């Protein structure tokens, strides 16, 4: 059991420390908890893989873990919850736009059709994670500004309107922020970003949204589990 | 005939070549300016052209790779781009406690590592480092064509890829990585880490892939059911 107890003691240590705090050396810890030095080494390496600690020269220090978000139709806040992390969303702005030729094609609406755009910043533990710009065919969502809690999951709101998320199509690229994106996200011109572009489709294969998400690479990891059979 | 005409043009143009102005193209093919404008704009979305000031120029397209169990070279072939793999090195390792856990092998078990660089149209795209449980693949190092698909070779040995687990991170290259990929310390990269599992859910590999962000786009098509 001494190998299980050391892992629990490191978790308890972690609860009380700040980001950047160094752990005692591996040998001191091992002796504190009557386990091998290699046992402490391994538990620290597991924390590191979990994003909860990082190396600083010879030392292991407390890190702010990246949110590990599954690719698919799940939620940003649910992903962070799963890791014991506190995520939120902040309204940047609603914008009323119209669909140009390209966007009309993506959403399968008429050229000129009304588009409602929601822009929000995603946060975790007091720091900015990403900027989410969702363009919606406005005709599909009357009252959305009225019925929608802008801090909540838009996907849950869309599901509550009888619209099921049946198919998503993502592109994932790297990027750098422009001046506005950098200011919104506490970043600079050199900060590495993920740039995802999504179109979602409902049970009738009718487009739900086109969503652009620009995430700071230092605050986000994406995970994707694929099966051969389906 | 306008998306086709532009395709025909791109065929003959070099990276960096500027198209004629929107109005000229429109008048050349007897279509509206808006029609030319839309076609160039979706060519831009496909990554095949890019803006340079007031002009639109031919771009080197990013390879569009579906996440999953398909082929890198097949993906590039889908876009009419030539793609290949070049041997860096084979290495003989032993599994540490972490890797032994990942591969479901004993600690100390022999590990055969294959490192290769991925190229498209003469330029480097990525560094692929595959760690294999050596016991699973007798004779691989001696016989395998390192330019070919390792996934095809593993399947040829009776091992089907059934499940894959990817993590995707951003990264910057170290000195060696920068040298291998024609990059510098500031070049944005994708760092992908995969574990793949066979028909019995036994690990096949642990694969690290470091790609130049300027040469790679990942795509994912997901279904609810």
Curated annotation (Swiss-Prot), chain A:
Sorted UniProt keywords: Cytoplasm, DNA-binding, Repressor, Transcription, Transcription regulation
Compartments, as annotated in UniProt: Cytoplasm
GO CC annotations on file: cytoplasm
DNA-binding region coordinates: 26-45
InterPro entries: Bact_HTH_transcr_reg, Chorismate_lyase_/UTRA_dom_sf, Tscrpt_reg_HTH_GntR, UTRA, WH-like_DNA-bd_sf, WH_DNA-bd_sf
Limits of the HTH gntR-type domain: 1-65
Listed name of the protein: HTH-type transcriptional repressor PhnF
Annotated organism of origin: Mycolicibacterium smegmatis (strain ATCC 700084 / mc(2)155) (Mycobacterium smegmatis)
Lineage of origin: Bacteria, Bacillati, Actinomycetota, Actinomycetes, Mycobacteriales
